[PDB]
Amino acid sequence: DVLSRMISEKAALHGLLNCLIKEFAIPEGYLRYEWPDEMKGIPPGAYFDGADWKGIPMMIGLPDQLQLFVMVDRRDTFGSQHYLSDVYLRQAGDWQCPDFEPLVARLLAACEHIAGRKNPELYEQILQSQRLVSAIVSHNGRQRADAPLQHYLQSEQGLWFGHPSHPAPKARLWPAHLGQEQWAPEFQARAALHQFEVPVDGLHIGANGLTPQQVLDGFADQQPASPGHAIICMHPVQAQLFMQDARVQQLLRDNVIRDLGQSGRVASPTASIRTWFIDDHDYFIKGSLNVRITNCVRKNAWYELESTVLIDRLFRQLLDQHADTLGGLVAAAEPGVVSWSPAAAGELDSHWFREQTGGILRENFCRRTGAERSIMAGTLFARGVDLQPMIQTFLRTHYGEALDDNALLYWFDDYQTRLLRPVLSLFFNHGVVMEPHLQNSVLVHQQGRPQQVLLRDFEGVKLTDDLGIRYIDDDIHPRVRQSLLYSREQGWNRIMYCLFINHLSETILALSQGRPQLAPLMWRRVQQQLRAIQGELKQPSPELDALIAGHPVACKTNLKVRLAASYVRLPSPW
Template identity: 65%
Template sequence: MRCPSYVNESYVISRASTAPHRDTDITIETTPHTTFGWANLSHLDSSIVVPQAINQRLLRRHLNGQRKGDCGADMTNTDRTVLSNMVSELATTRALLNCLIKEFALPEECLHYTWPEGMQGIAPGSFVDGGQWKGIPLTISLPNQQQFFVLVDRRDHLGSHRYLSDVYARQGQGTWRCLAFAEFARQLLTACEHMTRASNDELLDQVLQSQHLTAAIVAHNMTGQHPAPLSGYLASEQGLWFGHPNHPAPKARLWPEHLAQETYAPEFQAQTALHLFEVPLEGLRITSNGLSEAEVMAGFADQSRARPGHALICMHPVQAQLFMQDRRVQRLLELGDISDLGASGLLASPTASMRTWYIEGHDYFIKGSLNVRITNCVRKNAWYELESTLIIDELFQRLQQTRPETLGGLSTVAEPGSMSWAPKGVSEADGHWFREQTGAILRENFCRRSGADCSVMAGTLFARDLRSRPLVHDFLQRFNGAELEDQHLLDWFDEYQALLLSPVMALFFNHGIVMEPHLQNAVLIHDNGRPQQLLLRDFEGVKLTEELGIKAIQVGLHPRIRQSLLYSREQGWNRITYCLLINNLSEAVLALSWERPHLAPLMWQRVERQLQHIRDELVLPAPELDALIAGQSIACKTNLKVRLAAKADREANYVRLASPWATEARYA
């Protein structure tokens, strides 16, 4: 895997004093060894915890510049390299701790909000500032005698914390140490491997690759030359700089070495023309709902350029390069059966998914295949998903027309057309291969009706900026003008969570439809910052329960398509509760209650009330919802465990976490 690298040297900290003094001098020296520790420089800005190996003057310039909207344009390259590496290590450390806490420490009862036995090695400045405690102690003691210690801002049943101090580690009763990032990651993964009895030799490399790419992303966006992440829709798609907050390697990509990510990755504000091939009309497969074949074809490329009897298909430029490496494709090119027209298609910008393209002013997004492993999945359009997407689109169209009152205010992003191509006369296996390589889906460009300036992807809305602060506060402040009051944050959250919960629950209990409402699949439409509508997208991930949902399909299904759509009721419930409560709402709660942890239990009370309101409106039995309201534990997907086992994402299991309203949680 090739990751753009801005790092040419390592740096080591040199302190004049270890006392927690506000005027302690910190200098940076070059060294061939990386020996980073972590330090809380909260006297510079109470919202950011930074590694020791960073100059205070550099940090002040970074923070002050960002407040003015300048992300560091006046920094030297060395300054930017050091700072971007530190910010990326912080983000990756947070993600690893989140995985450890949610998947291991909480369900295995290895986490305690207590001081560890023995504090040797922990600097007093890490937990006391001017006689005041800096936070709540959190100690994790794992079966292999590995321990971790950090201060947090709250006790949280779902393991969502703001980390306030250095992260310390030790074995047994040894001395606590702040570890170099790579060593911290190694020790954490080793402890998790011991608990799962599974090992993945690639995982540590993936974690480090993810961190390196994150550093390059941070350095690129630190220049202040790019749109703010929540300034508009495309900026929000390209502003998810740190990725999934509960994933061990959110930016790991098995990218072709000869193709620079800066040219194609959303975090670098890439824009490029799609790659075109001319293929015979014979072999073209088009499926649609409410569109003619000509309209579907025009959605992908300007067909006036094609010769008679031919059509133009478009691809991700990287996918096109991979496609042409296959000997079957090379033979077709040599024979002239297909023609390579190069990067001459629509000018498009990649969104956060890497393979879905936004074309300004166009009626559709284009979701194509990308045979690159991103995190843990190869992002191709499987042949059966090209079919099932249109089946789900038709189902939603029908329900909106015939039973809208049963959908809980559902707003979806239509996917009314798909197109793929395979040469005539090939085997079934080869036909499937060609369709998966060439297949693409049209997705409605909702910005044409909702306005790009009024649309933001929820994953970025609740993500962090380059100072490790939630972006949502500056977003709301921009529209509110005055200081945000607690009540304003509570009311805003109330509106957001109602828009999210109602349709997902209504679809599950009324129709047996299982959405995948994680943060990246949700787009908020707002009016001067106030939630107006929440769009749920990506029909590839929609499933149907076997006892209800699958019965609504009115066409005969190929067995493989049926299999891809089918979920048991238990599978469906686990998925939607994880996506709703842990992936989505717990991140919203953490971001909105930043520096105000007392708001979190009030927000969860509103979730509980909304669930009760939904239950009161349901006619059919809803035993799972009854149990959830009563305080039953919540399913949490095991993103780290499935990667330790080197399994596909679809094979991830769940652990159980305590409900945030089952027992009162105390907050700092």
């Protein structure tokens, strides 16, 4: 219990450190890889192991004269490195190692002095998130540390720390009465989904390769529905918020709709919380949840429910008709969408009801791939309850021995090509902007060897205004079209961050933990892969040229955006 608290604080601190390094120190030039002139306050065991220095010193000198010291295993331009000591703070006095909360307080105040703007809400989110990770580790600390990597659902239920470059990755504002553990994947939550009986004249159903009834069937068994009615499902927390609304109370009172309780399919929430998994079912069920997670209430709007159908259609056409220009793309289909609103509702009431009741079927790819062969990428490259990258033991078990350098380099090569070739082919050949971050990527493997990196989530897919746009029919509603369109520039900036900083930085760090020498080798292979992709490309790709040539890389901010700034630039690995 003390151990779990100490594990959770170390993880939280490393999360915040990552943010400070990427979003401020590196781009503003506050970082130096040097020893302080005076070390008074730092014990020798912090930076010295009896033989040599514990890696490399890192100095961060902030404009309010707070200095931070930590030992790191490498110099990395993207600010990806393992922290080899406790963090030491010195103000304009001696070095101290404060407790978790006093340190977070001091560090945040420094960032606020840079940004100009203070944020007291964020400080409590950071503390709450750490407290939640503590209970997570305490709950899960009995099992093998690499158990999240053995089963697909376990990988969705095994992202103990969340986004590893985020100030408060487990911040969640649940409705007042609930508590954090109840609907948390990290506590292996299961629940029967909530159901409503609703009249079919209020239904809006998008279907690709399915009939509207097959889509309904996918969300809920329709047997309880009376004639003229269908059954729809909802997150049980969402259902309770839904029913707090007087419009819903009225409909219930007039028997227009019917509350069927938690009588839906028993499902398990995935890492994204509002998407549910069922083992022997053909679909994931993604519903609306009006809960603020990582400081954001993400709703699926009506126009987002509309563009899902269009994007699913697009991907099916591209997979069928344009395979030679998709770089081996493998993506999960989203062939069904449902929402409900009263037939005679006005526009604004109709938009509200459809946002509340919105539901999306995603292809359950496990049925094809096997649960023991599919791992969500974020968990794959995450740390276990012992704070070690889980992938190291996962790989050793599969290969039959402790992987040497050569085997890790080979594995990285097979992984990265299967991520980069599909994503960059979609973007440059077709103007399709994927969101290939760790949560939206799934490794399919054979005895540990990468086979596919399956891509997920049409919700964030965009189409470029100079190319991807042509897949939108002139007949589509303007708000849906606006919802889809990015500029080429917007697309590439997002791709830059997602592919290299969000995704492959974490992959390389996780693989190279005790072997920092491997990082530049792995990045050098990325550079060469990008060259090979560029020759493979059909349409022109000057952005790819610039990347290859060493142009600085766009980095999305997670802390700096909260003190506002949404992007910074990080120097290239080559």
